[PDB]
Scaffold this motif. Structure first.
Motif, PDB file in Angstrom:
ATOM      1  N   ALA A  78      51.795 -76.056 -56.396  1.00 24.07           N
ATOM      2  CA  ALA A  78      50.351 -76.245 -56.327  1.00 24.07           C
ATOM      3  C   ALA A  78      49.729 -76.219 -57.716  1.00 24.07           C
ATOM      4  N   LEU A  79      50.185 -75.306 -58.576  1.00 24.83           N
ATOM      5  CA  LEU A  79      49.657 -75.257 -59.935  1.00 24.83           C
ATOM      6  C   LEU A  79      49.986 -76.533 -60.699  1.00 24.83           C
ATOM      7  N   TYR A  80      51.210 -77.038 -60.543  1.00 26.07           N
ATOM      8  CA  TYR A  80      51.594 -78.280 -61.199  1.00 26.07           C
ATOM      9  C   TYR A  80      50.699 -79.425 -60.753  1.00 26.07           C
ATOM     10  N   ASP A  81      50.478 -79.546 -59.444  1.00 25.83           N
ATOM     11  CA  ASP A  81      49.643 -80.635 -58.955  1.00 25.83           C
ATOM     12  C   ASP A  81      48.215 -80.504 -59.462  1.00 25.83           C
ATOM     13  N   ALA A  82      47.695 -79.279 -59.534  1.00 27.88           N
ATOM     14  CA  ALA A  82      46.345 -79.094 -60.057  1.00 27.88           C
ATOM     15  C   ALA A  82      46.249 -79.543 -61.508  1.00 27.88           C
ATOM     16  N   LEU A  83      47.214 -79.137 -62.335  1.00 28.77           N
ATOM     17  CA  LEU A  83      47.179 -79.526 -63.742  1.00 28.77           C
ATOM     18  C   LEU A  83      47.295 -81.035 -63.904  1.00 28.77           C
ATOM     19  N   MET A  84      48.174 -81.673 -63.132  1.00 28.04           N
ATOM     20  CA  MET A  84      48.325 -83.117 -63.270  1.00 28.04           C
ATOM     21  C   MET A  84      47.095 -83.866 -62.776  1.00 28.04           C
ATOM     22  N   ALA A  85      46.420 -83.351 -61.747  1.00 31.68           N
ATOM     23  CA  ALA A  85      45.179 -83.978 -61.312  1.00 31.68           C
ATOM     24  C   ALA A  85      44.107 -83.861 -62.383  1.00 31.68           C
ATOM     25  N   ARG A  86      44.007 -82.694 -63.023  1.00 28.72           N
ATOM     26  CA  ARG A  86      43.096 -82.564 -64.156  1.00 28.72           C
ATOM     27  C   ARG A  86      43.417 -83.586 -65.232  1.00 28.72           C
ATOM     28  N   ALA A  87      44.702 -83.758 -65.541  1.00 28.38           N
ATOM     29  CA  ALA A  87      45.090 -84.690 -66.592  1.00 28.38           C
ATOM     30  C   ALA A  87      44.680 -86.113 -66.243  1.00 28.38           C
ATOM     31  N   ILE A  88      44.976 -86.549 -65.019  1.00 27.60           N
ATOM     32  CA  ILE A  88      44.602 -87.901 -64.607  1.00 27.60           C
ATOM     33  C   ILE A  88      43.097 -88.090 -64.704  1.00 27.60           C
ATOM     34  N   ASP A  89      42.331 -87.153 -64.143  1.00 22.05           N
ATOM     35  CA  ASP A  89      40.879 -87.290 -64.157  1.00 22.05           C
ATOM     36  C   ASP A  89      40.350 -87.384 -65.580  1.00 22.05           C
ATOM     37  N   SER A  90      40.868 -86.552 -66.481  1.00 26.30           N
ATOM     38  CA  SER A  90      40.362 -86.565 -67.847  1.00 26.30           C
ATOM     39  C   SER A  90      40.866 -87.753 -68.652  1.00 26.30           C
ATOM     40  N   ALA A  91      41.933 -88.419 -68.207  1.00 27.51           N
ATOM     41  CA  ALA A  91      42.448 -89.562 -68.954  1.00 27.51           C
ATOM     42  C   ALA A  91      41.457 -90.713 -68.947  1.00 27.51           C
ATOM     43  N   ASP A  92      40.938 -91.059 -67.777  1.00 26.55           N
ATOM     44  CA  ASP A  92      39.897 -92.068 -67.633  1.00 26.55           C
ATOM     45  C   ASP A  92      38.614 -91.377 -67.192  1.00 26.55           C
ATOM     46  N   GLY A  93      37.609 -91.409 -68.053  1.00 25.71           N
ATOM     47  CA  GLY A  93      36.411 -90.633 -67.835  1.00 25.71           C
ATOM     48  C   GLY A  93      35.904 -90.044 -69.128  1.00 25.71           C
ATOM     49  N   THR A  94      36.807 -89.773 -70.055  1.00 23.33           N
ATOM     50  CA  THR A  94      36.409 -89.326 -71.379  1.00 23.33           C
ATOM     51  C   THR A  94      36.185 -90.536 -72.274  1.00 23.33           C
ATOM     52  N   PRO A  95      34.982 -90.740 -72.802  1.00 27.89           N
ATOM     53  CA  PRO A  95      34.740 -91.899 -73.664  1.00 27.89           C
ATOM     54  C   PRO A  95      35.697 -91.914 -74.843  1.00 27.89           C
ATOM     55  N   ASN A  96      36.296 -93.076 -75.095  1.00 25.90           N
ATOM     56  CA  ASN A  96      37.310 -93.202 -76.132  1.00 25.90           C
ATOM     57  C   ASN A  96      36.741 -93.800 -77.408  1.00 25.90           C
TER      58      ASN A  96
END
Lengths: 38, 53
Positions: free
Chosen positions: B12-30
């Motif tokens: 569950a912790l792994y999935d939470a961290l990877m979901a955070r990573a995906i969300d922050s990958a697209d959504g943060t202005p580059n």
């Protein structure tokens, strides 16, 4: 051979009581071993 | 008596961290260079400054 008289009668006298079928492990220990399996 | 008993927390912790990573990958202005002019620049040569930059 077997003399039938061991020195462990120190506890059945009063520290314990005969004919009661006491369990071998405290319930706390059982629960600890249970949740330690997860 | 299976290994799946004791890996609920880490999976569950792994999935939470990877979901955070995906969300922050697209959504943060580059983009870089947050450039800002002033409120006295004749908006019309501000465009000229922007084209120059």
């Amino acid at each position: 051979p077997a003399p039938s008289a061991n020195p462990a009668k120190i506890f059945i006298r009063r520290f314990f009581s005969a004919g009661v079928a006491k369990n071998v492990v405290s319930y706390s220990n059982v629960m600890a071993a249970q949740r330690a399996m997860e | 008596n299976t290994p799946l008993q004791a890996i609920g927390v880490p999976v569950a912790l792994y999935d939470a961290l990877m979901a955070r990573a995906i969300d922050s990958a697209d959504g943060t202005p580059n983009s870089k260079w947050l450039v800002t002019a002033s409120r006295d620049l004749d908006d019309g040569q501000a465009k000229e400054v922007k084209e120059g930059i």
